[PDB]
Each structure stands twice: as structure tokens, then as C-alpha cells.
Design an enzyme around this catalytic site. Structure first.
Site, short mmCIF file in Angstrom:
data_model
loop_
_atom_site.label_atom_id
_atom_site.label_comp_id
_atom_site.label_asym_id
_atom_site.label_seq_id
_atom_site.Cartn_x
_atom_site.Cartn_y
_atom_site.Cartn_z
N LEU A 107 0.83 -1.20 0.00
CA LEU A 107 0.00 0.00 0.00
C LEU A 107 0.87 1.25 0.00
CD1 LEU A 107 -2.83 -0.89 2.56
CD2 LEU A 107 -2.92 -0.98 0.07
N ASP A 108 0.32 2.31 -0.60
CA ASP A 108 0.87 3.65 -0.51
C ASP A 108 0.50 4.25 0.85
OD1 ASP A 108 2.01 6.12 -1.05
OD2 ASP A 108 0.82 6.52 -2.86
N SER A 109 1.20 5.34 1.21
CA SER A 109 0.90 6.07 2.44
C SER A 109 -0.48 6.71 2.38
CB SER A 109 1.96 7.10 2.71
OG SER A 109 3.22 6.48 2.89
#
Ligand SMILES: CC(C)(COP(=O)(O)O)[C@@H](O)C(=O)NCCC(=O)NCCS
Ligand SMILES: [Mg+2]
Lengths: 79, 115, 69, 111, 217
Positions: free
Chosen positions: A37-39
Site C-alpha cells: 500500500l501507498d501512504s
């Protein structure tokens, strides 16, 4: 409050969220390399925390959780 | 007054306007009984061998007082069904489009500025 | 490459905290529109455009040019 | 009265497919409330247009001007303006290409 | 003393009572709204109600480039360029939908009418929208700004070179040939400055008008 309530409600809203793959939802279930996942997706998970089991979560502390053991522990002593 | 044959300064984010061309876009028909268009009239317009309906947003001859007067003949493109070709309009648009009877609500959602 | 590290996610979570203070509209289309403002834009851009889009994120947060209700 | 609350009543009572409004600040002298709402099809947007002008016309405000529905012949777009507010019934693809929600929040900060 | 040009009538065979009536209404408006001293160079900002917005107001800033009109219907047209576009508005000074007329920068230019600014460089016509009103001191004459502007190429709005216009705020030397200058000195009319029957003397007019001003106080 029941501590296992914290456990299965953090775990529960982690199961309620849809984009993640419930494959390794451990207590060391990480976001960027465990689930990829991205931030933006991480704060989307914080959004998936505060909606039912949260509402007091600070942004400096929600930036660096990254595993639901730290989440259960942090809401545990937070309450 | 924007009659036939007048050179027209198209203000749009449209493909037809901001494309370079050897002919300036000029009016062909004005959709009034007299052939004189004011702020908030529809005209035909020749862009790149393509006639196209258009809407007059400000001209250079003076109108009533408290209304603005531009230093070009600013014109926004529109399609036949009535929705505009453009996406953004940079040059300011007078609020005098609001009172007139016709398609103006579509264009006033697009303006960056209002004069 | 953005203005800083913490500021981007700070404005993100701040827009979500306004996202629950949203009152009249379909909040899930709202949140998906926040995604499409942030997912397909904030991936692989030059360090100058990062600044400008976080500045329109700033203005979109403040809402002195209008606010979503 | 016919407020934005009453508009939410008219559109959620119709079950409008998608709702997003912007409170336009008073300086940008177009309107106060800027409603963006989509529907199923031309029949849906058309019928809910005639519904909301039906309810505003029938409701109150005799001295206030009668309101003309704009773009009855076009398919994707439809728009209706009142004193305080203006509603845009359109399609979410049309919403994607005209990106109005960006504009009335970013007046000079977009493309 | 500064008497604003709208009170001085043009000469004509109309009745003085009509200007008594007009000046009465003009002063009755000047109770409500404060009409300041401003010249044809000064930068103004005007707040107006909008007939199209529901009681929202607006602000336009620019240069007063003309002070035409006498009486209650008198105007001033101010100019600015924004978004790479030139705009002008004719403001009626006594239209009751104007709320305030603030003078940002009171200054007088060399001319009485700056309509040549339509043909100058756009830098001579652009201004900041949010610019701050510069403070003037109470007891002093006005700063006569002279600025011979630079002109865009030859097909102008009017032939400003011609001496019937008497334009002073041009650097003609940059943008006009000596041959075309000497051609423009053909339309000179040197006698016209020297006839004494064209001169409208507003002196006793000024007297009766200042007793109209003082008597309304
Ligand atoms: C900075 C970061 C790598 C942080 O994500 P995380 O995976 O470290 C990511 O969120 C990102 O690329 N953000 C860019 C923000 C931005 O420039 N937005 C405007 C797009 S032009
Ligand atoms: Mg001319």
C-alpha cells in the site's frame, strides 16, 4: 473495555476494508511490503480505523503505526 | 455589434480555438433578425474550415453604463445541442449573461473570473 | 519531491476529517473523488508540480474559494 | 420555504444518483449554493428536472421569478438556476470531462 | 478649492433652475455616499451592488481615463487589464447601487483624458486588484504624475498625433517618424487658441455653485 474487543475490532475493520488482500492479516500485518500500500492507502486505513473504532487518533501517531499490534496497543493505552 | 465577417478572439480551452491556423476565426451568421450581435447572442463561426455555433461574451462597442467593455471580441464556442466545447474560460465574463433568455447557465459554470 | 513529507499526508487526513464533517452530499463519491484527486496524480511527478498541486490541496483544504457541504 | 435543505429533500426523495454541492462564497458573485447532481439517463435527469421545478413552482415564492430549465434538448447536460442556488443535473462522465467540482473550489488553481 | 466637474454646466440656453434642481439631488446623494476628489489619472476602486446577484457586491479597480458628463447623470470610465484582457466600465457617479468609491492613488496625469491608453503598452494599463490605498497628506497639492507612455504600432484607435487632441503623455519620439510628425502638424489650427468668443468663463458659475455647496451644510 475488553482487550480482545480492541483486538477483533481493529482486526474487524481491517476485514471491512475492500482494497486490501486479507492474506497476511497478522499483528505484524504491514502495509507497504506485506499488503503493498501507498501512504495514501495507509491514511485510508486510518480513515478505516476512526470510522467505528477510534475518533481520537492523532496524526503524528497515525503516520507511523504500520502494524495492527501497535494499533491495538496504542488504542489500548489510549483508552 | 458583432456582425458578419468580423474577426473573433475565441476564449476557450477548446481544441478549435487554441489550435494555430492561418485564418483568424470570423463570424458568418448572426442569430437575430438584424445581423448585429451583442453580449449573449449566438453566431456561426468559421474555425479551421469548420462552421460552429458560438456565444458572444463581451465586445468592443459600448453598451449600457455599469456593464464592462472589452478590447477584443471574446467568444466562447458551443455545440449544436447547446453544451459548450470549452472546459475553462480565462478572460473575465460579464454577469450580464445571467438575465438574458437563452443558454447561459452552462457557460457561467466555467468562468475563472467575473466582470 | 513534495513540499515536505508529513505535510502531504497531513493535508490528506485533514481533508478526510472535513470528509466526516461533510453533511449534505454522498460522502463515498466524495471520498472516491478525493482518491481520484490523489491516486492518479501523486504517483510519478516532477518535484516542481508536487509543490503546485499541494498548494491547490492547501487551498482546497482551507476553502476560502468555497467549501463542499 | 425552499432552502438547500428542501433541495436535499427533493433529490434524496427522488433518489438522485450522486450529490455534491459547494457553498460559493459571496465575493464570487454568481450564486451561494452550487449543486452538482447526476442521474440514470436523459429520462431520469429530465423527469427529476420537471420534478424540482414542479415542487419549487408549486411550493412557494410567487414574487420570485419563474425559472426556465436550460438545455432541454441536449442529452447529457441540464442546469437550473434559482436565486440562492443553481443545480446541475448531468452525467458522471460529463462530470468527469467538465470537472466542475474542482473549479468552484480551485478558482485559479486547476486546468 | 476643488469643485468636481459634474457641477459645472456646459454652456447652452437651458434654464438655471434645472441645474438648481439637479444640484439639489446631487448634494442629497453626497450626504449618503462620500464622493471624493479624484482626477483623470487616479486609480479607483468602486464597490457596486449587482442586479444579477442577490445583493452581492463587487469591486472594480482601474484608472479613471475620462470624466465626461455633467449633472446628476455624470460618469467616469475606468480601465484595467486582467487575464491579458482589457476592460473598461462607465460608472455613473450617482447611480444608487454604488456603495463606496475609494481613491487608491490620487494623482493627476498630463492630459485631461487618457483614452490613448487603449493603444499604449498593456503594462501602462495593468494594476494590482488588491493594491493598497497609498496615504496622501491632508494639506498639499496633488502629485502630477507625468509618464510619457510607449505606444503599440501604428494603426491606433485614433490618430493621437494630431494636434486637435493635444496629447502630452506620449513619447512620440520612439513611435513616430519626423515626416509623419510634420504631416501631423498640418491640422494645426493656430488661431483657435486665440479667439476670445469660444472661451467659456466659469467664474461666477463657480461662485453661485459654492454658495449652493455651503448653503447645503
Ligand atoms: C511522497 C510519497 C512517496 C509518500 O508515500 P509513501 O509510500 O512513502 C507519495 O505519497 C507521493 O508520491 N506523493 C506525491 C505528492 C504530490 O506530489 N502530489 C501532487 C501530484 S503532482
Ligand atoms: Mg474606431
Amino acid at each position: 473495555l475488553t482487550l480482545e474487543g480492541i483486538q477483533d475490532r481493529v482486526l474487524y475493520v481491517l476485514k471491512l476494508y475492500d482494497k486490501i488482500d486479507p492474506e497476511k492479516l497478522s499483528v505484524n500485518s504491514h502495509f507497504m511490503k506485506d499488503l503493498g500500500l501507498d501512504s495514501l492507502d495507509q491514511v485510508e486505513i486510518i480513515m478505516a480505523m476512526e470510522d467505528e473504532f477510534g475518533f481520537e487518533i492523532p496524526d503524528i501517531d497515525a503516520e507511523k503505526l504500520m502494524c495492527p499490534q501497535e494499533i491495538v496497543d496504542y488504542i489500548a493505552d489510549k483508552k | 455589434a458583432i456582425q458578419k465577417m468580423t474577426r473573433v478572439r475565441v476564449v476557450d480551452n477548446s481544441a478549435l480555438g487554441n489550435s494555430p491556423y492561418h485564418r483568424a476565426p470570423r463570424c458568418i451568421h448572426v442569430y437575430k433578425k438584424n445581423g448585429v450581435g451583442k453580449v449573449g447572442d449566438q453566431i456561426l463561426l468559421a474555425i479551421k474550415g469548420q462552421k460552429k455555433k458560438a456565444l458572444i461574451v463581451g465586445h468592443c462597442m459600448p453598451g449600457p453604463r455599469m456593464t464592462p467593455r472589452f478590447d477584443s471580441n471574446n467568444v466562447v464556442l458551443i455545440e449544436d445541442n447547446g453544451n459548450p466545447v470549452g472546459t475553462r474560460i480565462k478572460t473575465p465574463i460579464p454577469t450580464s449573461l445571467r438575465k438574458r433568455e437563452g443558454e447561459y447557465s452552462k457557460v457561467l459554470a466555467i468562468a475563472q473570473n467575473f466582470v | 519531491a513534495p513540499w515536505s513529507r508529513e505535510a502531504v499526508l497531513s493535508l490528506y487526513r485533514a481533508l478526510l476529517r472535513q470528509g466526516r464533517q461533510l453533511r449534505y452530499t454522498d460522502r463515498d463519491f466524495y471520498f472516491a473523488s478525493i482518491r481520484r484527486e490523489f491516486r492518479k496524480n501523486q504517483k510519478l511527478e516532477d518535484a516542481e508540480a508536487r509543490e503546485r498541486q499541494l498548494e491547490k490541496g492547501l487551498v482546497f483544504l482551507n476553502g476560502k474559494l468555497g467549501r463542499i457541504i | 420555504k425552499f432552502d438547500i435543505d428542501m433541495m436535499v429533500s427533493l433529490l434524496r426523495q427522488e433518489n438522485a444518483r450522486d450529490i455534491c454541492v459547494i457553498q460559493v462564497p459571496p465575493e464570487m458573485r454568481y450564486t451561494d449554493y452550487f449543486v452538482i447532481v447526476s442521474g440514470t439517463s436523459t429520462r431520469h435527469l429530465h423527469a427529476m428536472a420537471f420534478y424540482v421545478v414542479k415542487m419549487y413552482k408549486h411550493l412557494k415564492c410567487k414574487r420570485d421569478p419563474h425559472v426556465k430549465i436550460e438545455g432541454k434538448d441536449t442529452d447529457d447536460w441540464l442546469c437550473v438556476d434559482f436565486g440562492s442556488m443553481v443545480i446541475h443535473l448531468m452525467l458522471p462522465e460529463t462530470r468527469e470531462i467538465y470537472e466542475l467540482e474542482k473549479l468552484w473550489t480551485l478558482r485559479s488553481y486547476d486546468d | 478649492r476643488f469643485l468636481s466637474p459634474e457641477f459645472i454646466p456646459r454652456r447652452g440656453r437651458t434654464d438655471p433652475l434645472k441645474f438648481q434642481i439637479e444640484r439639489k439631488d446631487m448634494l442629497e446623494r453626497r450626504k449618503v455616499l462620500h464622493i471624493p476628489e479624484f482626477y483623470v489619472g487616479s486609480i479607483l476602486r468602486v464597490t457596486t451592488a449587482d442586479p444579477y446577484a442577490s445583493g452581492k457586491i463587487s469591486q472594480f479597480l482601474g484608472i479613471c481615463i475620462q470624466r465626461s458628463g455633467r449633472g446628476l447623470g455624470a460618469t467616469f470610465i475606468l480601465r484595467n487589464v486582467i487575464e491579458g484582457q482589457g476592460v473598461e466600465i462607465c460608472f455613473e457617479l450617482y447611480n444608487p447601487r454604488v456603495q463606496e468609491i475609494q481613491v487608491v492613488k490620487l494623482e493627476k496625469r498630463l492630459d485631461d483624458s487618457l483614452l490613448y491608453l487603449r493603444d499604449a503598452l498593456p503594462e501602462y494599463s495593468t494594476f494590482d486588484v488588491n493594491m493598497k490605498p497609498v496615504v496622501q497628506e491632508p494639506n498639499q497639492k496633488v502629485p502630477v504624475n507625468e509618464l510619457k507612455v510607449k505606444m503599440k504600432p501604428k494603426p491606433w484607435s485614433k490618430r493621437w498625433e494630431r494636434p486637435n487632441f493635444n496629447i502630452k503623455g506620449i513619447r512620440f519620439d520612439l513611435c513616430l517618424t519626423e515626416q509623419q510628425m510634420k504631416e501631423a502638424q498640418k491640422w494645426n489650427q493656430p488661431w483657435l487658441e486665440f479667439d476670445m468668443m469660444r472661451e467659456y468663463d466659469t467664474s461666477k458659475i463657480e461662485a453661485a455653485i459654492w454658495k449652493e455647496i455651503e448653503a447645503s451644510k
